[PDB]
Amino acid sequence: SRKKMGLLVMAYGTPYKEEDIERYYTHIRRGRKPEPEMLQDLKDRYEAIGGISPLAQITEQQAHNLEQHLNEIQDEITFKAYIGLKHIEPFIEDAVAEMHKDGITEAVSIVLAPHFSTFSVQSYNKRAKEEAEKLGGLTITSVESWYDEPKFVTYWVDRVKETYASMPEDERENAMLIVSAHSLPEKIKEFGDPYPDQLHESAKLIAEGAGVSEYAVGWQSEGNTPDPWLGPDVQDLTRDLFEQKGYQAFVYVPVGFVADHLEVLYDNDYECKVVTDDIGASYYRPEMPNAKPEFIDALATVVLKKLGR
Ligand SMILES: [Mg+2]
Ligand SMILES: [Mg+2]
Ligand SMILES: [Mg+2]
Incomplete structure (x- = not known):
């Protein structure tokens, strides 16, 4: 009886291992590779905060818990989460292409940053929508701020x-x-x-x-x-x-x-x-917030309100 919907969760993105620092910051710096000293300083900062591996995992946990919670708190829609990032794979366009490939025809998106800006949120949303338009047969309603x-x-x-x-x-x-x-x-x-x-x-x-x-x-x-x-x-x-x-x-x-x-x-x-x-x-x-239940319920509520549910 349920309608299937893609849940496009977007975020800045984070490196997966120390070896990713160079390419992650080069992307952030618009093609300008950090000099050697900066590269070493960045590795030192990541070591100081406890390591890199937990970073992307939090984001993954947020999307995963959001998906399951939305699925448990209402009975009309079954959501499948897709993570789309700005500065490292999976990029926004890769996620939308995967939704399309998997057969998703309707999706709701939310960015993991509460305030709207022309610089980030608007651009993330525009990118997701242009990829869906390029592929066709898929539409996205995007949360702008929460x-x-x-x-x-x-x-x-x-x-x-x-x-x-x-x-x-x-x-x-x-x-x-x-x-x-x-x-x-x-x-x-x-x-x-x-x-x-x-x-x-x-x-x-x-x-x-x-x-x-x-x-x-x-x-x-x-x-x-x-x-x-x-x-x-x-x-x-x-x-x-x-x-x-x-x-x-x-x-x-x-x-x-x-x-x-x-x-x-x-x-x-x-x-x-x-x-x-x-x-x-x-x-x-x-x-x-990280992936704590209280935050996940707040995000779920934001998503359902955007869909009029
Ligand atoms: Mg290594
Ligand atoms: Mg600084
Ligand atoms: Mg508003």
């Missing part, structure tokens, strides 16, 4: 609540919550890109839900290009806020990210921690 799904907001609200409950009374009263996402070039403003506004809205929703009156919005992990990227960067924001008001604890919620990848494990857990240790403040960074 940062405002209540269940997702609640996930972070409750992790933030636990973190503040865990602090000594003196920290609890002199803490600063920093909500961030991946920085992008400021030129996206030329298109009226809502990306910045959505991150600020996530920060408002989370702080408000957790009853946090002192918070700030920051960006992290910017690429190196001659044109300016969205700021302030979390490292600078932390120091400036400390110099101006003397906060004793900083809590980082990298809401734009959904997994324990390099951006969180190194750019927050190491780079932000260097700063907090330098100023004598405590560092807190609540658990990323």
Whole structure:
């Protein structure tokens, strides 16, 4: 009795082993192979965060748990998950071609980044749709953003609540919550890109839900290009806020990210921690969603709402 549908889960992508660093970053750098020192530095960062093998596995687990959960919570549709990536195989186009080959004629897609941007989400969605158009006989309805799904907001609200409950009374009263996402070039403003506004809205929703009156919005992990990227960067924001008001604890919620990848494990857990240790403040960074049941149910709800179910 069920209708079969493809579930196209898209993501930035991550290397599978250390030997993939070169090609993964060359792709990210638009064809410019990292110099030897940079290649070695990257290997060192990945070693520091515990290894590469767990990275892509989280993403795989997210798509797999999402598929099974969607299949268990409703009885009209049977979903088959397909992972499509931007910077390493399986690429977005490979996944759509596989759905077509397997006989899928109808699919719903969702990107594993909650905020919409012209730079990433819009482009991922456009690519998936152009491949389906090229092949024919297959259509895709794509989720554009989901940062405002209540269940997702609640996930972070409750992790933030636990973190503040865990602090000594003196920290609890002199803490600063920093909500961030991946920085992008400021030129996206030329298109009226809502990306910045959505991150600020996530920060408002989370702080408000957790009853946090002192918070700030920051960006992290910017690429190196001659044109300016969205700021302030979390490292600078932390120091400036400390110099101006003397906060004793900083809590980082990298809401734009959904997994324990390099951006969180190194750019927050190491780079932000260097700063907090330098100023004598405590560092807190609540658990990323990863493939936990609570997150998977939030994503399932986002997908069913998009299909009017
Ligand atoms: Mg090896
Ligand atoms: Mg919306
Ligand atoms: Mg960096």
